[PDB]
Amino acid sequence: ANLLKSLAAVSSMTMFSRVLGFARDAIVARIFGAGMATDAFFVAFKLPNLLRRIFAEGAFSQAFVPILAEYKSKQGEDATRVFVSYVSGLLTLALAVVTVAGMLAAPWVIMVTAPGFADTADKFALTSQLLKITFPYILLISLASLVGAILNTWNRFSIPAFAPTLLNISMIGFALFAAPYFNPPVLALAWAVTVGGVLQLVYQLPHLKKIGMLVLPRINFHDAGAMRVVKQMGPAILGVSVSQISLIINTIFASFLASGSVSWMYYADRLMEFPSGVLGVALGTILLPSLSKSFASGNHDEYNRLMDWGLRLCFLLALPSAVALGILSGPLTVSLFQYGKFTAFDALMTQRALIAYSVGLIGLIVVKVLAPGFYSRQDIKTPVKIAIVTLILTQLMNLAFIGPLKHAGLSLSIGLAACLNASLLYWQLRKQKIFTPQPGWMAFLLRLVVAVLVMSGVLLGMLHIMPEWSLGTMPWRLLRLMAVVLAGIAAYFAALAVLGFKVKEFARRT
Amino acid sequence: MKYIINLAFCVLLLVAGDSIAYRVSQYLAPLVDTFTKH
């Protein structure tokens, strides 16, 4: 049951992080307006967040956690300590080099990133200052996520999940209180993320002390563990760049599209990355350490059981979510984005991109389940091979769909790209005789889909009772929003309960 | 040795993702509007 408890804890903590995130820019825009200073900090803060995809989130984790599990299971806790100290030191050196690079080349990075900031002299001078202040955040979040990764390997998931929203509270305090202490006050926000990064790191040392994994970052290039981490980081960086290329060409097609389409894709992606980030990302952080421990220990039957449990729970929590987002594509857009600058036209286009993205919503989450399967096997080359294959085929459906579907085609093609990426993941797993699903899958699907028709029948029935959503103000429109969905999911879980489905069937130990 | 170029290439991709997309968008823009009627 602790596997469900950990998954619920991470998903709930991420839920807290996102709602704190929405409050973050709401107050920031309220107190700092929406001038050239506000988006200057946004650019200076998003840049370390993309570098997080390399050193903290999307490249370092799958290249380090599987090695950590093998070291812990076989060699012992002493060899694990010397290994983690060496890799942490090498990681600190890598982050220090790039951080120092940004220190003496902050103006160069600004013009490289945003050409629209160099022409504005007063914004260029401002953004260079903030970028200098918030650059060490990538250093702090690199160790913060490094400690979060090892804690996850030791079955501590609540503590790392608190770190993201913890930075939100630190930033909320700096903006609310230390506004007049800086001239201009925007530098307070720049210091806020830096202080948040330190506060994130210092948070987990008391927990790291409990397991005795605290280590000074010693340096040894010749050490085998560090060399292996870098060796596997090779394909990991290749996968990150491959996904980056796919994102780049998606932007190329979007730019060629009709004017104003980029905003619709941005908002649809916001409403699409919200559930996949809460569900799929959280599922990755729990499965990856657990699968790696089972594979390293030689418990292949537990590796298959964990893979099956992650797969069935993914279907259980993603299929209703995808259909619900598709059904409420209209209500969601008109209750979150149809305010002043939006009309009925813009909300309609966002709803069409929402249903197209929600088709692949199941694909995005299940990819976050299948990808740790090969990441667990210390075979990162295969996911990249699927990634490039998906990349090339994504473009040929992109140029096929832009014709008759325009922005809806781009969103739908991304959705099918993730879904077929997952089927490629499934095919490779079965072809190499690795994952053997437990019997009873067919009954699981048929009982799941009929619950989805319960979701739709209740939701469209409640929608037609619910009068026009444009009526009312902010609090009234939002209040009716979760009100319908909580009754819908309650009906969904009631349908699951009367269908012979119980929580104990999804309870996993260790 | 080859690892460094891979790290630098992907760092460039993340840091300059908007600018490379913008750079090629009007670079191949004359190429694509001439492709429309062909």
TrEMBL record, chain B:
GO biological process: viral release via suppression of host peptidoglycan biosynthetic process
Protein name: Lysis protein
Source species: Enterobacteria phage M
Gene responsible for this protein: lys
